[PDB]
Amino acid sequence: GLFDRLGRVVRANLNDLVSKAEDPEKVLEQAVIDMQEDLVQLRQAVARTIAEEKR
Amino acid sequence: FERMENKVLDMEATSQAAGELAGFGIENQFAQLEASSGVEDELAALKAS
Amino acid sequence: FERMENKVLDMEATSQAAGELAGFGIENQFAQLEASSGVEDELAALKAS
Amino acid sequence: RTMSENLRRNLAALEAKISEAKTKKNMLQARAKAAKANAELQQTLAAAAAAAAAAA
Amino acid sequence: TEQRLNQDTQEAKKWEDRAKLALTNGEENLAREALARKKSLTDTAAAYQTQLAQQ
Numbered sequence: 001g002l003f004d005r006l007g008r009v010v011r012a013n014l015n016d017l018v019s020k021a022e023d024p025e026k027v028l029e030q031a032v033i034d035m036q037e038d039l040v041q042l043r044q045a046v047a048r049t050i051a052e053e054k055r
Numbered sequence: 056f057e058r059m060e061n062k063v064l065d066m067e068a069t070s071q072a073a074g075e076l077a078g079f080g081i082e083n084q085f086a087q088l089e090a091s092s093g094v095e096d097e098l099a100a101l102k103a104s
Numbered sequence: 105f106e107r108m109e110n111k112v113l114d115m116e117a118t119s120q121a122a123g124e125l126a127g128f129g130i131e132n133q134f135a136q137l138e139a140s141s142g143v144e145d146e147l148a149a150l151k152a153s
Numbered sequence: 154r155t156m157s158e159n160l161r162r163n164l165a166a167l168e169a170k171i172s173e174a175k176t177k178k179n180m181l182q183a184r185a186k187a188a189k190a191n192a193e194l195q196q197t198l199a200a201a202a203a204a205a206a207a208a209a
Numbered sequence: 210t211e212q213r214l215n216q217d218t219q220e221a222k223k224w225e226d227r228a229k230l231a232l233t234n235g236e237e238n239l240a241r242e243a244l245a246r247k248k249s250l251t252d253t254a255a256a257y258q259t260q261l262a263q264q
Contacts, residue, residue: 025185032174039167043076046160050072053154055064079165081242090230093223127159135166136159143244147237150228150244169242173249176217180253183210184260 210264214257221250 077083085091126132134140224247231240 025182028178028181032171032178035171035174039164039171042164042167044073046157046164047072047076048069049160050076050157051065051068053157054068054072076161079161080168081239081246084239085227088230088234091227093226123156132159132163135162141241141245143241143248146244146248147241150240151232153229169245172246176249176253179213180256183213183257187210187260187264 210257210261214254214261217250217254217257221247221254224250 224243228240228243228247231237231243
């Protein structure tokens with residue numbers, strides 16, 4: 001549709017406008033912080049399912 | 056009594072699973088190897104003396 | 105009681121289907137293969153030593 | 154108990170790639186400091202050549 | 210960068226020694242894990258050598 005095509009244009013400009021706000025030096029270490037605490041959340045949920053196989 | 060027994064078995068399993076899963080992971084698992092400290096060469100060089 | 109049993113069976117099926125479908129996909133499926141890590145050549149070269 | 158094996162392997166495959174990511178982060182943050190220092194140097198040499206005091 | 214190079218060459222020795230220790234204990238699945246840690250260190254050390262000679 002025409003308004004799909006306009007939507008994908010205006011949406012892509014906004015996504016590029018964000019992408020050049022990303023400083024490689026700051027974001028590259030935050031990405032590793034986020035990925036580490038994701039594992040802390042995951043390990044809690046897994047263990048909570050192990051408790052029930054035991055049970 | 057029977058209702059209170061199940062509460063105990065829920066606590067026991069919750070503790071054991073969290074402890075078992077933390078028993079995985081490379082550092083904790085390598086720490087169980089005897090020669091894991093990494094001075095066996097200079098130890099051997101000392102034993103040679 | 106019977107009305108509440110059906111609610112339980114609806115939850116159980118909703119959880120199992122979403123988990124089963126996420127069990128597909130190449131990465132999760134390859135992660136189940138034993139030699140999937142991709143160092144078996146240098147592992148073999150080390151075993152040769 | 155066929156699911157917990159799958160999850161228990163997926164949990165170890167994650168931490169393996171965190172360790173790799175963290176080693177690369179150090180090498181990349183080094184290269185980004187070097188490249189930025191050289192950019193300021195090359196900008197300084199251009200402005201000096203643009204003033205051309207030795208031609209005046 | 211010359212400091213960083215001297216760490217990652219001696220850190221890779223630690224993981225090579227631990228892999229041999231695992232194989233003498235027959236724990237071949239743990240030996241693979243150590244070898245994966247080593248490879249990522251020997252690949253980044255080669256970047257520091259290239260960077261440093263250019264600098």
